[PDB]
């Protein structure tokens, strides 16, 4: 019961947060510096950019995850250096120029030619920023501060197909005559620095009226260079930056995503608690015949829809999951209506919503029974030779593997048990020496996923290694927990950290581990 109290405190904190919690990252913080110098916290955002720069000149994570945020930071710094000051600077033109030049070096020396991860909207965001950087470079003179003058007239290029710019040009031309698709409102700033393009600010429920695609950057682009100070979008930008003292996340709010993920983690934990009615009411109000999004102001998607249906049904509010049928395709389910790459985690979550439904409403077993077993087919067929899965929405194989193995363990039937064991084997094989797991380092989030996987799929027949591994995982979680520094691993513009989501995952792990 110490963790019962923790569960109740987590639920209460979630109720009291109608935004959800996403930590700031470099991408949108830089976008606001470039697009919204009028906004409070501008100097703080410049400070954040200076502080967050890596010693190799880049910003962000390894393996090419530095490309988008470095582009954003460099463009913002060039834009700032070319303008008059918003207020008395704490960082001199020389300080900013040093950061900028080192960012240019990192772009030229490896990032532009390196891997390009499939972050969201990268085919728009990356060429957009590269073109603005080149424009700024052409305008530099040799009297630019520091070594930045030496960069005057440089043209940066990239061999990467995603940086080509042809698709961006097409969408820019199209949006002179037709509205930007709803799913791209989140990336409006790539299309235009100042314009609307048929994107519509959220109107209706607080707390984010005026936001465009739940993106601070897109909202800045929509409002333009000199917005009306009474505009709702201005209040959204003010609120978001104030929450963190200047820096901003790339997606906010995430309320429905957070509510469902928190509730599903707690349901999995085995802890006793009462779900506050306010969470279940929020989710029900948001759910429609077309499903639900991560938050109001975004288009519906099947991952969020499936998670929300599962969360509601596990807490006594069962709804027929018919909204998921819109996303049925040949052999699997899509996440959005139109997509190039399927999501493994989405199909896992759909398997849970459907499987759980037919369990709790046995009369509907014929309605979804087939879909359940074909998603089973597909998840099994998409497991990698080493026992892991990967997913389009997340940088970590620990997320994807936990999602798929846990869905298959509970709803895949005995044909799927071999795959689950291969996933647990992969978990044992990938554990770090200190008991943690993670892609680039041991993390709370990734460790939590593996502890859950191992505990929830344990059988009487499981070797002793399973319990000891999960125990060492729990030891790692107990040894260090710093939510303020949880790394961002979820794909958006760069990669973001849904902090409360991670805290809920940690709680579930520790409860299941008996820590």
Question: Which architecture characterizes domain 22-244 according to CATH?
Answer: Alpha/alpha barrel (1.50)
Contacts of 203 (CB under 8 A, 6+ apart): 209, 232
As a whole number of angstroms, the distance between CA 156 and CA 172 comes to 22
The CA-CA-CA angle for residues 424, 425, 430, to 5°, reads 95
DSSP track, 203-246 = -SSTT-TT-BTTBHHHHHHHH-SS--TT-HHHHHHHHHHHHHTS
Q: How many residues does the chain have?
A: 515
Enter the DSSP assignment of 480.
-
- Structure method: X-ray
* Alpha carbon distance 260, 272 (integer Å): 17
Q: How far, in Å, CA of 232 to CA of 59, rounded? A: 31
CATH-assigned architecture of domain 255-513? Alpha/alpha barrel (1.50)
Nearest-10 crossing angle of helices 397-411, 444-456: 20
Are 32 and 250 within 8 A, CB to CB? no
255-513 has the same fold as 22-244: yes
Integer Cα distance of 1 and 97 in angstroms: 54
Query: Which token pair is 306?
Result: 């499936």
Omega of the bond leading into 207 within 30 degrees of 0 (cis) = yes
Nearest to 289 by CA among 248, 319, 247, 312: 319
Cα 314 to Cα 77: distance, rounded to the nearest angstrom: 48
- As a whole number of angstroms, the distance between CA 269 and CA 266 comes to 5
Residue ranges covered by each domain of the chain: 22-244, 255-513
Query: Measuring CA to CA, how many Å separate 126 from each of 10, 222, 234, 401, 414?
Result: 37, 19, 26, 29, 45
Degrees, nearest 5: CA angle 194-28-505: 140
How many CB atoms neighbour CB 433 within 10 A?
A: 7
Burial annotation 135-169 (CB, 10 A radius, 16+ → b, else e)? ebbeebeeebbbebeebeeeebebebebbebeebe
Q: Which of 379, 431, 385 is nearest to 405 (CA)?
A: 379
CB neighbours of 97 closer than 8 A, spacing ≥ 6?
77, 81, 144, 145, 146, 147, 148
Residue 174 CA neighbour count, 13 Å, CB half = 10
| Other CB atoms within 10 A of residue 105 CB | 17
| PDB resolution in Å | 1.8
Residue 31 CA: distances (Å) to CA of 49, 145, 234:
11, 22, 15
Q: Cα(502)–Cα(258) distance, rounded to whole angstroms?
A: 10
Q: Which residue has the tokens 């020496």?
A: 433
């Amino acid at each position: 019961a110490p963790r019962e109290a923790e569960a109740a405190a987590l639920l209460a904190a979630t109720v009291a947060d109608p935004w959800g919690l996403v930590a700031p990252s470099v991408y949108d913080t830089a976008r606001l510096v470039s697009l919204a110098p009028w906004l409070d916290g501008h100097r703080e955002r410049l400070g954040y950019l200076a502080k967050e720069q890596n010693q190799d000149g880049s910003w962000g994570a390894p393996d090419g995850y530095g490309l988008v945020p470095t582009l954003s930071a460099v463009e913002a710094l060039l834009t700032e250096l070319a303008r008059t000051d918003s207020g008395a600077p704490h960082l001199s033109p020389d300080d900013l120029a040093a950061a900028c030049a080192d960012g240019l070096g990192a772009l030229r020396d490896g990032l532009l030619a390196g891997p390009v991860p499939d972050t969201i909207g990268v085919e728009f965001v990356a060429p957009s920023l590269l073109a603005d950087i080149n424009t700024r470079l052409a305008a530099l003179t040799e009297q630019a501060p520091g070594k930045l003058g030496a960069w005057s007239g440089t043209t940066l290029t990239s061999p990467a197909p995603d940086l080509d710019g042809a698709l961006l040009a097409g969408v820019r031309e199209m949006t002179e005559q037709a509205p930007l698709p709803e799913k791209l409102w989140h990336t409006l700033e790539a299309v235009t620095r100042d314009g609307t393009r048929g994107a519509r600010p959220h109107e209706g429920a607080p707390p984010h009226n005026g936001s465009v695609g739940c993106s601070p950057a897109a909202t800045a682009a929509w409002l333009g260079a000199a917005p009306d100070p009474a505009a709702p979008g201005v209040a959204y930008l003010r609120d978001v930056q104030a929450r963190f003292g200047g820096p901003v996340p790339s997606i906010t709010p995430i309320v429905y995503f957070e509510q469902a993920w928190v509730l599903n983690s707690l349901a999995a934990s085995g802890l006793r608690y009462e779900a506050p009615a306010a969470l279940l009411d929020s989710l029900e109000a948001g759910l429609t015949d077309e499903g639900i999004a991560a938050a109001p102001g975004l288009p519906s998607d099947s991952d969020d829809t499936a998670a929300v249906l599962f969360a509601l049904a596990q807490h006594g509010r069962t709804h027929r999951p018919d909204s998921l049928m819109h996303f049925r395709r040949d052999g699997y389910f899509s996440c959005f209506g139109v997509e190039r790459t399927p999501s493994t985690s989405t199909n896992a979550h759909i398997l849970e919503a459907l499987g759980h439904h037919v369990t709790v409403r046995p009369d509907d077993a014929g309605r979804y029974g087939a879909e359940i077993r074909m998603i089973s087919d597909w998840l099994l067929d998409n497991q990698l030779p080493d026992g892991s899965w990967m997913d389009k929405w997340h940088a970590s194989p620990y997320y994807a593997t936990a999602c798929c193995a846990l869905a298959l363990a509970e709803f895949g039937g005995p044909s799927a048990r071999a795959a689950v064991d291969r996933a647990a084997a992969w978990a044992l094989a990938t554990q770090r020496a200190d008991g943690s797991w993670g892609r680039w380092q041991g993390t709370t989030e990734e460790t939590a996923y593996m502890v859950q996987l191992l505990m929830r799929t344990r059988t009487p027949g499981s070797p002793g290694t399973v319990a000891r591994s999960a125990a060492r995982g729990c030891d790692a979680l107990l040894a260090h927990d710093d939510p303020a520094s949880y790394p961002g691993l979820w794909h958006d513009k760069d990669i973001y950290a849904p902090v409360t989501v991670i805290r809920a995952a940690r709680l579930a792990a520790l409860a299941l581990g008996g820590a």
